[PDB]
Structures are given as C-alpha cells and as structure tokens.
Amino acid sequence: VCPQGKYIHPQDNSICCTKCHKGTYLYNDCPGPGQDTDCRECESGSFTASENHLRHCLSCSKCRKEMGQVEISSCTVDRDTVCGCRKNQYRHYWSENLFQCFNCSLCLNGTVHLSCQEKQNTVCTCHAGF
Amino acid sequence: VCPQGKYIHPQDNSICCTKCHKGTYLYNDCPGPGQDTDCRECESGSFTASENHLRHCLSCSKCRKEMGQVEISSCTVDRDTVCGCRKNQYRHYWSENLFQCFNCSLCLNGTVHLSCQEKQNTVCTC
Amino acid sequence: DKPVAHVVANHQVEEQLEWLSQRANALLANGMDLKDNQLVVPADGLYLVYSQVLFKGQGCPDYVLLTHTVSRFAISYQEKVNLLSAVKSPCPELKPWYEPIYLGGVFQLEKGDQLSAEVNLPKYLDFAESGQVYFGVIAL
Amino acid sequence: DKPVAHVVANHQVEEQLEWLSQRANALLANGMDLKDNQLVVPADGLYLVYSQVLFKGQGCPDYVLLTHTVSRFAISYQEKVNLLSAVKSPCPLKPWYEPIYLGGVFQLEKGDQLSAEVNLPKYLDFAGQVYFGVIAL
Amino acid sequence: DKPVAHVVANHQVEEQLEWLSQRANALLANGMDLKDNQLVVPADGLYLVYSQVLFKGQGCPDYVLLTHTVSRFAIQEKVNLLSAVKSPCPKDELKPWYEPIYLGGVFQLEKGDQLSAEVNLPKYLDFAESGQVYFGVIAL
Ligand SMILES: Cc1nc2ccc(-c3ccc(N4CCNCC4)nc3)cc2n1Cc1ccccc1OC(F)F
C-alpha cells in the first residue's frame, strides 16, 4: 500500500512513489522517498490520459473515415484524438466505442417532432400518411 | 486399478474411491477406504450425465434458434438439454452435433414414397 | 506451477457476456482470479492472452457490425486499453451464418492488472454448445 | 522434459482428417502418444491445447457449414466433451479460403484422450499447417 | 525463458505498415529483436508465427484486392510462410466493410532468420484503434 497519487517502487518495497501526470510517462522511478519520479512528456502521436506509471505513452487513435468521422480535436499528450460528425449529422453507435456519421433526417412528407441531436436522429412525424 | 464404480485417489495410491453419480460432481475425495466421496449436486444451468470424478459440472447446452430448433427436454442435473424440430419438419445434420430443422417436403404432383422421418426428408416420387 | 486461466461464457445469461470458472474444462489456477468479469494477474510477467467468440445469425435482415476486444486495465495506467481487437461485417430464405473470432497474443503484465474480454452485441453470440466462447490467460 | 505433441494432417488421405506424428514439422515426445487419431496425455497436468485447420473451396454451389472441434474424453468423465469449437459459413463461383484456429489451457489427467476433427474433410486444404498439438505447461 | 515478440502497427505512418516494439502493450523479449521492420530470431528452433490485420472500407467504389503475407528471410532468400487474399468488393447505398485477416503457423527457424509481415495496400488498413494490427512470434 502506497498513499494516493503514489505507487510502490518496483526494486524497493520501502520507497513509495509519485505517479506521473496525464501528458507524461514514467522514464524512471523516484531515486528515493523525498524525490520526484523521472516522468517525461509523450512524443508526438502518443498520449497518456490519466495518472500513470506507464513506461510508454499510448498511441493516438485515428478517426474512422470509413464511418465518415471527422476530427474534432487533434491528439495531444494528455488526451487521445476526439472524433465526431459534421453539422447536420448524428452519431449512430454500433458499440460503446464505435459510431457512424449519418446525415440528419430532413422530414420529407412530415414535421420534425424532436430536433436532430448529436447521438440521435430527428424523431420525425408524417403528415396524414405513414 | 480400482474396482467397478471406484477411482484411484489422486493424492494416495492406496485409498481407492467411490465415483460420483450422474447429477453430482466431485467436491472432495474420500478421506479413506471405508468412507464416501464428498460429491455434490450440480448447480442450475449445469449437469453431469454419467458416473464421474469431475471437479465441476458441465454447462447445459441451449437449443439453436438460428437453426429453428426447439426444446424437447429442459436441462437437469443428470441430463443435458435435448433439442429437436417441430412436427412437419426433419433434422438435416451438418455435423455430428449440428443439425438444422427444415419443413418436410409435401409431394406436389406426386406420391409420398417413404414418409417424412425425423432425420430425413420425404423420399418423394413426382 | 505457473498462473493459468480458462474461463467460458455463461449460457444461462444471454444479453451479457459473463465469464465462468466453475465448470468442467474451465479453469482458474495458481493465483489467477476472476473478479467483476475480469481475469486478474497474480504476478508481474509474460502472458499468453487469448479469447474466442462465435457469432450466430439467421439470414441478414438488418446489417450488423460485430466487435470483439480483449483489453487491459493496468495498475500502471488504470483506464481500459485494447490489447487485441477485431471487427466483422457478416451482413451485405433466411440462411444461417456463423462467424468466429479468435484473438491471441503475448503480453508483459504486472501483478493486479485486470484483463477483460467483451463484445458489442452479446445477443449475437452462440451459447449453443460449450467450447465456442472462452477467455484465457497463460503465464509464460 | 515436458510432454509435447505437434501432429499434422495426412495429405495422402483426403476424405478423413488423419493426424501424423512423423511428418513435415511434426513431433510426439515425453509420453505424448497418438492412438486412434487421438492425442493421449501421459500425466495429470496443465496443458496448452491447440489446433488449426484450413478450408478451401471454389464457389458455393450448395450451401456449406464447416465445423472444427477439439474434444476431451476423460477418465474422470467417460464421455466426449467439447473443449474448443467453432462453426463457419464461408459461402461468399469465386474461390475461398477459411482458416479456423482454436487454442486454450486445460487441466487434464493421465490417460485423457484429446481429439481434433472437422465435419467435412473434403473441404480441407492439403498444404501441412493443418495441425493439432498439445504442450504440457 | 523462451524468445517472444508482439509488435504492433504504427498509426502515425499511414501508407506503410510499420511495426513498433517501443510501446505499451507491445513486447520484445529473450533475444527477439526488431530491425528494419522485421522480427529477428535469436536461436534455431520451432516458432509460432502469427499476424493479424484489419482492412476497412466505405462502400465499394473501386474493386480492391487485399493481400496479407508473412515471409521468412533465412540466413539467403525470402520465402512465403503465410499468405491470404481477399476481395471484399463486388466489382459492381455505400455501407462500410471490415475484413480482418489472421495468419498463424508453426515454423522451424534458425538463429538470425528475419520474419516480415506486410500487406499490399496499407491505405486500407484500419489504424483507428489499438489491438487491430499486430505481428508476433513465440518460441515453442
Ligand atoms: C492456433 C494456434 N496454433 C498454435 C500453435 C502453437 C501454440 C503454442 C505453442 C507453444 C506455446 N508455449 C511454448 C512452450 N511453453 C508454453 C507456451 N504456446 C502456444 C499455440 C497455438 N495456437 C493458439 C494460439 C494462437 C495465438 C496465441 C495464443 C494461442 O494459444 C492460446 F491458447 F494461448
């Protein structure tokens, strides 16, 4: 057991150590109890998005062009790439971590009941029809 | 070598022991020669369908809806679930343990030569 | 001697991929443990990590995408990270289709790391028979 | 030291998946034995059990399903039981190739017999990396 | 004890399938080395050699052929060990398609042999997420 924000030093179970912040990776453990861990900033194309004692950053995801996704936010050291859909589109999620961009329904032969949301199409009602 | 209904105790080659009945699984071996094996009944959704010294029961099968199968008999501790086909259907086996239910062939412009069996369609002259 | 795990799908719970250890020919040994549907490594080391799933479907009414992913929740990190992942589009008389997915690889892991193996659509899994859905770990 | 087996398909016998121990990259060692097309464990223990098969076809004239199954016939439970199983519908006259690979770790007892078979050997592909193997951990 | 490798696709280099070892959840051990995009065996022996790739596409505009090949350069010519071809397209609604390809086999190898795993059209690979493209070697 180490306190919050700390991890147990791998070579010496007495020394007990500061985790690294989002944006950085463990290059080398704390020399000793007082001192800081040698953490270093993620290279371009990689990131760490939480407190860690990882020895390499994680690879940034790329957006799914096959799903018509578009980059909202580029990758950065403390946050993985953020993907979305163009305006006048909505995410259809197939899985927790897999969605597809579809053009919002304009309500042909009908009235837009609920507006087109981000993760849901226009709840959309027909006129005296079907 | 142990006698009928018995198995050799894994930790002690002298002690030689009563197998467990269909419906139960070996929780623990006989302490010694006179005594009985600590066998226990299968939990719901599992079963053992023969004399055993298994350390857990096997999982019940479910029927294949994608093949239009139907439950003949439900699972139970001493017998796995039994699947089949509706009446006016026949099993087509793709593997030893994989069949599909198909509607029996009615013999249009023809005479049913052999009737529709369970694991075979109507030999059918037209 | 070495930690090993072979856990199998629960057939009784369709609509969720739930792993079971207490079954004949399912195993959990030498420190491998199963907590909250995740296999948990008992010591730092190299491990063989694998999982299989079998997806069933009767004709292709609606177009589906299936995903299968094994992921690591490390002490060192503490967010879910993909180790092994795959996607399949099995869809364009209702003829039935079967699509297996097997993932396997070798990984450095630390004591307490939690591995998970899940799919997007459990309803499409095939719990007909045993041996068709499993998730396992072997210490090298 | 530890029992191992890596057996491979017999190419000369199409229409049956027959395992061979003396062959292209094939082995049987330290008590592993091959009797009646089944690998036989020489001692209680943990084992890695694996098999691969490769299915070939030119078109899908009539609809095919392929199955591949590894199964255990234990002393402890004297009935054939699935350890690893899979089904595939390869139907896409375009030619097709479909591998199936199974692997897992299993507790086994001396004398248990493992088998690895498919439903339609005629669809297998003489080409060697059809194999069935067992490694004692 | 035994040489092992699990390397993964570089997402940062689209248009080439470049393997990475210096990465979380990518591994290189017990003599396995990675030089010039090729895994290099540290001793004569039997090896499990495996690779997975995931090919993506949105509808089928142009008809494509995908190949995935693992090959051996023994210590002085390259030999195919594992190969597969896929025509995911109709040659005819633009629905997205996913085509995974897994190759694996056991091979006798000699110290210094260099294994490589490549595809014909990297542009079609799916570097969206991690776990989807890897190349690995395990000494039996
Ligand atoms: C389809 C197949 N073909 C195989 C061929 C060989 C082995 C294999 C061979 C040796 C081994 N060792 C080396 C000796 N010590 C223990 C681990 N571990 C696994 C596994 C094989 N598998 C299954 C498999 C593939 C990829 C990763 C892991 C796999 O096995 C899984 F069950 F761990």
Query: What single-letter amino acid sits at A32?
Result: G
Residue A67 placed within a domain: no
For ligand 1, is residue D101 a contact (CB within 6 Å)? yes
CA-CA-CA-CA dihedral for C84, C87, C88, C92, to nearest 10: -170
Instruction: State in Å: Cα E4 to ligand 1 middle.
Output: 12
Residue B65 gets the label, from left (phi > 0), alpha (psi -120 to 50) or beta, of alpha
Distance CA B74, CA D42 (A): 37
B71 belongs to a structural domain: no
Q: Which two tokens stand for residue D110?
A: 């001396």
Dist. CA D48 → ligand 1 center (Å): 7
Q: How far apart are CA E65 and CA C73, in angstroms?
A: 37
Answer yes or no: is A112 within a domain.
yes
Taken as a whole, chain C contains a residue count of: 140
Is residue E101 within 8 Å of E55, Cβ to Cβ?
yes
Find tokens 């996913």 and name the residue. Answer: E98
E138 at interface of C, judged by CB pairs closer than 8 A:
yes
Residue A92 within a domain = yes
The alpha carbons of chain B give a radius of gyration, in whole angstroms, of: 22
Report resolution (Å) to 1 decimal: 3.2
Residue E8: its chain A contacts at CB < 8 A? Answer: 59
Alpha-carbon gap: C58 to the closest alpha carbon of chain B (Å): 5
- How many whole angstroms separate alpha carbon D80 and alpha carbon D71? 6
Q: Cβ(C10)–Cβ(C20) under 8 Å?
A: yes
Inter-chain residue contact C79 with A26, CB threshold 8 Å: no
CA A125 / ligand 1 centre spacing (Å): 56
Strands B111-112 and C96-109: unpaired
| CATH number of the domain that residue A19 is part of | 2.10.50.10
Q: Are residues B14 and B55 in the same domain?
A: yes
Tell me whether residue A10 is in a domain.
yes
DSSP H or E run through A35: none
CA distance C66 to C56: 11
Comparing C-alpha atoms, which of A56, A53, A49, A58 is closest to residue A2?
A: A53
Cβ–Cβ below 8 Å for C120 and A26 = no
Residue B48 placed within a domain: yes
Q: Does A44 sit within 8 Å of E24, measured CB to CB?
A: no
Q: Do the chains contact at D78 and B50, CB–CB below 8 Å?
A: yes
- The answer to whether the beta carbons of residues A94 and C120 sit under 8 Å apart is yes
Other residues' Cβ atoms within 10 Å of the Cβ of residue D22: 10
Signed CA dihedral, A40, A46, A49, A54: sign only: negative
Please state whether E41 falls in left (phi above 0), alpha (psi between -120 and 50) or beta. Answer: beta
Among A23, A42, A59, the domain boundary falls at A59
Residues B49 and B10 in one domain: yes
Q: What are phi and psi of A23, to 5 degrees?
A: 100, -15
Q: Ligand 1, atom 13: nearest CA belongs to which residue?
A: E140
The residues, ordered by sequence, that sit 6+ positions from B118 with a Cβ below 8 Å of its Cβ are B84, B85, B90, B91
Alpha-carbon distance of D121 to D18, in angstroms, equals: 9
- What is the secondary structure of C7-37 as a DSSP string? EEE-SS-TTS--EE-SSTT-EEETT-EEETT
Q: What angle do CA E129, E130, E133 make, to 5 degrees?
A: 105
Asked if the structure places residue B121 within a domain, the reply is yes
Strands (E), chain E: 4-9, 19-20, 27-29, 33-35, 38-40, 45-58, 66-73, 78-86, 96-109, 114-119, 134-139
HEC-encoded secondary structure of chain D: CCCEEEEEECCCCCCCCCEECCCCCCEEECCCEEECCEEECCCCEEEEEEEEEEEEEECCCCCCCEEEEEEEECCCECCCEEEEEEEECCCCCCEEEEEEEEEEEEEECCCCEEEEEECCHHHECCCCCCEEEEEEC
Cα separation, B26 vs D106, in Å, equals 18
Total domains in the fold of chain B? 2
* Nearest residue to A47 (alpha-carbon basis) of A73, A69, A67: A73
Secondary structure (3-state) at C135? strand
Six-digit token string for A36:
């800081």
Determine contact: B59 vs chain C, CB below 8 A. Answer: yes
Is there a contact between A51 and C78 if contact means CB atoms under 8 Å apart?
yes
B11 and B54 share a domain? yes
D91 Cβ below 6 A of ligand 1: no
Residue B106 lies in a domain: yes
Rg of chain A over all Cα atoms, to the nearest angstrom: 23
Could you tell me which chain D residue has the CA closest to the CA of E89?
Answer: D92
Alpha-carbon torsion C74, C75, C76, C79, what sign?
A: positive
Tokens of D55: 């299915």
Chain B residue at shortest CA distance from C22: B56
Residues A89 and A55 in one domain: no
D4, D136 in Cβ contact below 8 A? yes
Please give the backbone phi and psi of residue E123, each rounded to the nearest 5 degrees, phi first.
Answer: -55, -30
Q: Which of A49, A52, A98 sits opposite C76 (nearest CB)?
A: A52
Write the residue with the smallest CA distance to atom 26 of ligand 1. C104
Q: Which residues of B touch C99 (CB under 8 A)?
A: none
Contacts of E13 (CB under 8 A, 6+ apart): none
**Structural domain harbouring A111:** 85-126
